[model samples]
Target: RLAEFAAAEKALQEQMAQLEALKKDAGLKREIEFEQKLVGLMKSYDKSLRDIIAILDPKL
Candidate 1:
């Protein structure tokens, strides 16, 4: 029982470390910011993601 408890605690700590790293990742932050701005732009223009993508990359 004690060994199981320690294993669980260690696993949780590893997950927390991963979460912290993700929080500080610049690329992730940029992607989130871009998505938020894109959503706002879409809402203002009443456009879907596919519509914008098609306009930007016609071959798609």
Candidate 2:
């Protein structure tokens, strides 16, 4: 799971790079801010990315 998560993370970073190249400040800022908050939430929950996703974007 960690490996899967790492690969996804790398892919996400590359996507962000593309956004940066496209001058997507708003999009980048949103993702960066979400990451910052997610990191803190993860620390507080002692949880994984899936958990954060569930919290932030639950399917309902």
Candidate 3:
């Protein structure tokens, strides 16, 4: 369990480093904020991404 936790922590740290690099990208930063807002709205409605998409999609 201890080793698994350590590995997970390491993976998370690596991901944080990668995110920091991507943070310099303006387009990616905008999309990240958009996703955050979408996630917040989903939580407010107790809905998932698919729920929002299905409601908005005419062909669905």
Best candidate according to lDDT: 1
The global Cα lDDT (0 to 1) of model 3 is 0.87
Better of 1 and 2 by lDDT: 1
Per-model TM-score versus the true fold: 0.50, 0.41, 0.49
Model 1 misses residue 31 by how many Å? Answer: 1.0
Candidate 2, 1-60: lDDT as tens digits? 799999999999999999787777787888999999978887997999787679789785
Model 3 error, position 34 (Å): 0.7
What would the per-residue lDDT of candidate 1 be over residues 1-60, giving only the tens digit for each residue? Answer: 799999999999999999889887977889999999989999999999789878999786
Arrange candidates by TM-score, highest first: which order?
1, 3, 2
Q: Which 10 successive residues of model 1 have the least lDDT summed?
A: 19-28
TM-score of model number 1: 0.50
Give per-residue CA lDDT, model 3, range 23-56, as digits (tens): 7696788989999988898899899767877889
The Cα error of candidate 3 at residue 17, in Å, is 23
Query: Between the candidate structures 1 and 3, which one is better when assessed by TM-score?
Result: 1
lDDT of each: 0.92, 0.86, 0.87
Task: Show where candidate 1 strays beyond 4 Å.
Answer: 1-24
Clashes of each: 0, 0, 0
